[PDB]
Structure formats: structure tokens, C-alpha cells
Scaffold this active site. Structure first.
Site, PDB file in Angstrom:
ATOM      1  CG  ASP A 181       6.655   2.851   2.494  1.00 19.98           C
ATOM      2  OD1 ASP A 181       6.506   3.754   2.505  1.00 19.98           O
ATOM      3  OD2 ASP A 181       6.884   1.940   1.917  1.00 19.98           O
ATOM      4  CB  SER A 236       6.333  -0.734  20.055  1.00 25.00           C
ATOM      5  OG  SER A 236       7.150   0.357  18.579  1.00 25.00           O
ATOM      6  CG  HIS A 249       9.798   2.571   6.269  1.00 29.47           C
ATOM      7  ND1 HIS A 249       8.810   1.732   6.023  1.00 29.47           N
ATOM      8  CD2 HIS A 249      10.611   2.192   5.146  1.00 29.47           C
ATOM      9  CE1 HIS A 249       8.983   0.826   4.452  1.00 29.47           C
ATOM     10  NE2 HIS A 249      10.261   0.821   4.985  1.00 29.47           N
ATOM     11  CE  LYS A 278      -7.502   2.617   0.398  1.00 29.20           C
ATOM     12  NZ  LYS A 278      -5.945   2.690  -0.896  1.00 29.20           N
ATOM     13  CD  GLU A 299      10.454   2.070  13.546  1.00 27.37           C
ATOM     14  OE1 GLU A 299       9.684   2.171  13.667  1.00 27.37           O
ATOM     15  OE2 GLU A 299      11.593   1.116  13.571  1.00 27.37           O
ATOM     16  CG  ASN A 359       4.666   5.523   8.134  1.00 29.46           C
ATOM     17  OD1 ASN A 359       4.433   5.022   8.725  1.00 29.46           O
ATOM     18  ND2 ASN A 359       5.713   5.196   6.397  1.00 29.46           N
ATOM     19  NE  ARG A 391      -7.033  -3.081   6.686  1.00 32.34           N
ATOM     20  CZ  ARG A 391      -7.609  -4.144   6.395  1.00 32.34           C
ATOM     21  NH1 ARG A 391      -7.302  -4.087   5.119  1.00 32.34           N
ATOM     22  NH2 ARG A 391      -8.033  -4.235   7.022  1.00 32.34           N
ATOM     23  CB  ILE A 392      -2.454   0.901   0.223  1.00 37.79           C
ATOM     24  CG1 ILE A 392      -1.464   0.050   1.496  1.00 37.79           C
ATOM     25  CG2 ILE A 392      -1.682   2.259   0.204  1.00 37.79           C
ATOM     26  CD1 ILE A 392      -0.988  -0.732  -0.269  1.00 37.79           C
TER      27      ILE A 392
HETATM   28 CO   LIG Z   1       6.585   1.508   5.824  1.00 40.50          CO
HETATM   29 MG   LIG Z   2       4.860   0.899  16.552  1.00 40.52          MG
END
Ligand SMILES: [Co+2]
Ligand SMILES: [Mg+2]
Ligand SMILES: [Co+2]
Ligand SMILES: [Co+2]
Ligand SMILES: [Co+2]
Length: 216
Positions: free
Chosen positions: A145, A13, A109, A65, A174, A107, A91-92
């Protein structure tokens, strides 16, 4: 225009919000590539409906990775991506990927970091019983985060809220602070000093978003 790439893993979204903000002319950027690590993510269908190039790159397709991250960085570099946006990506990312985009990976959060870092942050807030939660757009680094904070939106928590009800309230914000951050990058207004971030000529000391929204 600012050329950006978006990494996704599911519903997407947040990717949709950026797409809509760009299409409506609120954000001066173009999504050159979307990378999904999940072949069944609905985010992929969104790209098809909006003619946004999408590539599915799965972790299992690489033994290590390091390889996996290298391939993703390379594909973004080939498209001239300047800003990398994680929208629901699961994924990290490590230095293997981040070294290519110094302070250029962000990012969204669903919590006011450093509070409730990690998975299910909305549920964490509800079970903990905080009175205020919200969302944060931050620069991705090797912490979970816990990187440079660009902008946050505060949301009140209700006595009867459950994971989904609070999540729904936070998601509205967000979809606003992430596209706004992209626009700020597009305007060359993101300044980094240490682990602190400042938005040029932005309005600070405001509620419920600090710094305040401009395109919304
Ligand atoms: Co997060
Ligand atoms: Mg999303
Ligand atoms: Co293209
Ligand atoms: Co697609
Ligand atoms: Co409450």
C-alpha cells in the site's frame, strides 16, 4: 461494458457497493467473476443473491504461490476481465499475478497512504492520534500500500474514536471512491504517467474527495 473481476476474502461490503452501483446504473461495468480465497467469506453469499459468478480458489490447493496466482490470473483472463479489484482480499499478490494486468489491479485501503499501511489501519490511526485519516484507491504493485494513487477521501478523527467507530466513518467513503474509480476506468479516463495517476476531466483541489466524486 467494462469487464471486471473482484478478489475477496471476507465480509465483502466493498464488493456489495460495486454490485449496487452497477445495478443502479451508476457504473457501466459487469462483474464477470469474483474469486474468494476463503470458502466461508460472506462475500460468496452476496454473489449468490445477485447472480454474480463466484469461484473459491484456496492457497492450500496449490503447493506453490506461483501456481496459486497463475490459476487466479488464468480464470480472470478466461472471463475477459480487464480490471481486477481487490475488496477485502487478504493475500499478497506478486509479479506472478500482476504481470498479466499491468496497472490494471486496484485496491481500496482504509487510510491516507503512505500513512498507516498494512493491517488494522483504522486502529493504527486511532492509537497514533492523527486528526485526519480516510481511504485510498490505489494501483497494486509490489509494495505494501504504497502504489500509484488514484483518489483519496479525507475523514476527521474524533477524540473518543476507537477502531470500529473510525472504521465505520471511513467505510462510507470506501463504498463511494472505489465504485467511482471503476466507473472512471469504464470511461477510459485513467491516465498513468510514472507512479502518478490522473483522471481525465475530473475536478481536482476539492474536499473531502480529490479528485471529486461524480456518480455520487
Ligand atoms: Co490494505
Ligand atoms: Mg470489503
Ligand atoms: Co460469466
Ligand atoms: Co457465489
Ligand atoms: Co481526534
Amino acid at each position: 461494458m467494462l469487464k471486471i473481476g473482484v478478489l475477496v476474502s471476507g465480509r465483502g461490503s466493498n464488493l456489495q457497493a460495486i454490485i449496487d452501483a452497477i445495478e443502479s446504473g451508476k457504473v457501466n461495468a459487469s462483474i464477470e467473476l469474483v474469486i474468494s480465497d476463503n470458502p466461508k467469506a460472506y462475500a460468496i453469499e452476496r454473489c449468490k443473491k445477485h447472480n454474480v459468478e463466484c469461484k473459491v480458489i484456496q492457497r492450500k490447493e496449490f503447493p506453490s504461490k506461483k501456481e496459486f496466482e497463475e490459476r487466479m490470473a488464468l480464470e480472470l483472463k478466461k472471463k475477459g476481465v480487464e480490471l481486477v479489484v481487490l475488496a477485502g482480499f487478504m493475500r499478497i499478490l506478486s509479479h506472478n499475478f500482476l504481470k498479466y494486468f499491468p496497472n490494471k489491479v486496484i485496491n481500496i485501503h482504509p487510510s491516507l497512504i503512505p500513512a498507516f499501511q498494512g493491517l488494522h489501519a483504522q486502529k493504527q490511526a486511532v492509537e497514533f492520534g492523527v486528526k485526519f485519516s480516510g481511504c485510498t484507491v490505489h494501483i497494486v504493485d509490489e509494495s505494501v500500500d504504497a502504489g500509484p494513487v488514484i483518489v483519496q477521501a479525507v475523514v476527521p478523527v474524533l477524540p473518543e474514536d476507537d477502531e470500529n467507530t473510525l472504521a465505520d466513518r471511513i467505510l462510507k467513503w470506501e463504498h463511494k471512491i472505489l465504485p467511482q474509480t471503476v466507473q472512471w476506468f469504464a470511461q477510459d479516463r485513467i491516465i498513468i504517467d510514472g507512479r502518478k495517476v490522473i483522471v481525465k476531466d475530473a475536478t481536482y483541489g476539492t474536499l473531502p474527495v480529490n479528485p471529486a466524486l461524480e456518480i455520487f
